[PDB]
Amino acid sequence: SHMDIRQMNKTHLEHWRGLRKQLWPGHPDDAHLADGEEILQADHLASFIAMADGVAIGFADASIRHDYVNGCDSSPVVFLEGIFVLPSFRQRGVAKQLIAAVQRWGTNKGCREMASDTSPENTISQKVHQALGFEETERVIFYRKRC
């Protein structure tokens, strides 16, 4: 059936929250709500919903980042902040089309580079990133200290 990638607006908020809670289970209930509203008002945040037959089968969150991005040489950068496709709809090209939409958005915003990161443990994600034309740039360990 015909699939559409829709940039998320007020009308897709429930579709998006329903999927996001499956990518990140236990990511607090009030966070998803505030995140939704922020994204709709942003010019440096956009999310994209894969729709077919009137149901939402996957999503991607994207940003335009001005912070230094690991492995990139230019600024700003279009960044893949999250991506998830429902188990039953996987390996059908949903993520490919989601990422194409993120790229289109970032390109129209004047980004020269698209970036993403994933866990060294998530081998499917690594294969996916590489199939869709991403190259590995560097691996890093992050640290934090409370101020």
Ligand X SMILES: CC(C)(COP(=O)(O)OP(=O)(O)OC[C@H]1O[C@@H](n2cnc3c(N)ncnc32)[C@H](O)[C@@H]1OP(=O)(O)O)[C@@H](O)C(=O)NCCC(=O)/N=C\CSCCC(=O)NC[C@H]1O[C@H](O[C@H]2[C@H](O)[C@@H](O)[C@H](N)C[C@@H]2N)[C@H](N)[C@@H](O)[C@@H]1O
Chain residues in the site for ligand X (CB under 6 A):
23-24, 68, 70, 80-85, 90-96, 116-118, 122, 124-125, 127-128, 131-132, 138, 140
- Out of 4, 24, 112, 127, the residue judged to bind a copy of itself by CB under 8 A: 112
Binding partner of 56, given ligand X, a copy of itself, Ni ion, none, CB within 5-8 angstroms per partner class: none
**91 dihedral zone (left: phi>0; alpha: psi -120 to 50; beta):** left
Q: Is 69 known to sit in a ligand binding site?
A: no
- Out of 13, 49, 50, 78, the residue judged to bind a copy of itself by CB under 8 A: 78
93 binds Ni ion (CB under 5 A): no
The 3-state secondary structure of 7-74 reads: ECCHHHHHHHHHHHHHHCCCCCHHHHHHHHHHHHHCCCEEEEEEEECCEEEEEEEEEEECCCCCCCCC
